[PDB]
Amino acid sequence: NVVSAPMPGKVLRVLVRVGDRVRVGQGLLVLEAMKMENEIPSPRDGVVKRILVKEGEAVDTGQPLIELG
Amino acid sequence: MLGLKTSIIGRRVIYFQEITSTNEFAKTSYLEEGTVIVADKQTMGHGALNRKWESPEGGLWLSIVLSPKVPQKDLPKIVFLGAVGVVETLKEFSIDGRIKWPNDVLVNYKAIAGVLVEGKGDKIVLGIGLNVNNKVPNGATSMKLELGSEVPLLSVFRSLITNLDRLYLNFLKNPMDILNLVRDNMILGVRVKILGDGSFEGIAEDIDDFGRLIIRLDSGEVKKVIYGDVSLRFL
């Protein structure tokens, strides 16, 4: 499906590349928000189909971040 | 055997001779709130904003599991809790520490400690690295370098955890108090440069209730800086 931003913030780093298999709860990327570094976990096991955001990009709540196969 | 007498932070403490990062372990393990992860040395220490943090033997490298359950607007103050705890501990040891907005503590303008807060779901991890008796990077300092002799590491640990517990309980009661403690303990009045898009110069004069750094430009105009959004440099 699709992993969206739980909150507004700035992408600090992307932890995965397209095509990489991930597990439930594995960090997909990191968002700098409210003087915290929020690691966004993958809702389920699967493969990374696409990465919708870039490091340095500002995002808002609900914005699509990663797409799994 | 540690004899800690805290209410939440320090109820349990997990020690490691060595580890990659205490923050990672605190994030990937299920742990009761207040659990403290500490290690003699860290080989993969995490700094904020993708920086690396040197963690040789002799220093205090720890992470605290927290479950504040507060509104999003109060989350920016968590880093401050860690910074102020360090300031208070340094004070007990007769060391004058100041906060370099928003997560570092300086003594005579040399970094002696750094704070990093990480979140992963409901879980929040407060990470703190304090130079005690360890070797430090050029331009930094430590308690041993300030005092002129070895400092009892466990006593520093006991002091810091005890201050953090009190600050945390106070935060739970009224999350607005920490802001004033920060304002009265941070480096203010210094001229700074904001780089990137819309570059400008001004005097760092205070923080707002979100922890945003307030900058007073020469024109009297006022601008607020969001951490991680722009680069800041002292002039």
Ligand SMILES: Nc1ncnc2c1ncn2[C@@H]1O[C@H](CO)[C@@H](O)[C@H]1O
């Ligand atoms: N233990 C430490 N004490 C003070 N500053 C540190 C420490 N480890 C890394 N740094 C700072 O972070 C930067 C490397 O990420 C360096 O420029 C250094 O000044």
Ligand SMILES: O=C(O)CCCC[C@@H]1SC[C@@H]2NC(=O)N[C@@H]21
């Ligand atoms: O100033 C900074 O950049 C923040 C440094 C935070 C360092 C501590 S050491 C204990 C904890 N474990 C880590 O990997 N990082 C934090």
Ligand SMILES: *C(=O)CCCC[C@@H]1SC[C@@H]2NC(=O)N[C@@H]21
């Ligand atoms: C410290 O760096 C300040 C944190 C940023 C706070 C501001 S309030 C306006 C924005 N909305 C939000 O949820 N966080 C941002």
